[PDB]
Amino acid sequence: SLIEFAKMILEETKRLPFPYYTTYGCYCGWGGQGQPKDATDRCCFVHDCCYGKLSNCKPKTDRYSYSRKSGVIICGEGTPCEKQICECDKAAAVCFRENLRTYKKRYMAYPDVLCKKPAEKC
Template sequence: MWVMHHTPCFVGSFLPSSCSASLPLSLALGCGGPVSEMAGSSQHPCSLAVLPAAHSSLLNLKSMVEAITGRNAILSFVGYGCFCGLGGRGLPMDEVDWCCHAHDCCYQKLFDQGCHPYVDHYEHAIENNATIVCSELNKTECDKQTCECDKSLALCLQSQTYNEEHRNYLNIYCHGPTPNCSIYEPPQEEAASIHISPEPSAPP
């Protein structure tokens, strides 16, 4: 994203925890989480956090969250719970926190596929401040899936109750086992059925 202290950042665990110590709070709105701690993958470079907004999907996410929830994405979700703020760890505190945890995992899956969701810019539309449409103009699978991840987060946040007591929560108080991203994966049998086409029936 950006290096100025007054530059906006966005909801969810968008940046790796290795970046959080060197970034101002406004830039590290979602550092860490499953991206670096849960999935066991290598941490992503902090250089992803200093690119102009014009080259980042995070501005799209900000507009989604604010249009759908009616809340300021920065003021409402910076430091919310254990996963919408710096360094996700422990058990999510409530359903809003679970939304951010799920978004961390969604991004992690994209990284595993070779995508760069922090900077992959995609096209989308918001109709009547209620419906998010990921555009058919998104040509790459990375763009399409990043849009779907962000759309899911915005809709998830909209459907949950916001708890003011969890705002600006210090994650040093987050305890318990950190849920693994595998909880969002379909059962193996279901996943196999998705990829295996049924054999054609024998001719009569």
């Protein structure tokens, strides 16, 4: 679901999902358009496309389980749906972790207006 993704975000970025990544740029937010701002903002783009590939599943609601080995998310527990959703969340979270340097705090609460131009094909 989005809960495990949130916990993943906290575990990988050491920053809470809100407000750091739920109101960011043009895609890191409930429904996004336009081109993505920075590298972090694009991670959410890839996350959406990833979710979009899983039409056979319910990425936002279907809860899953995940564990760690050498400090890396495994997420290999249940259904292929859950597995792939977990995979998307893992990719997005790691992408957040790898772009802490590029991360701009000014892009928090980046308005839907000035977010131009709608949109970008996956």
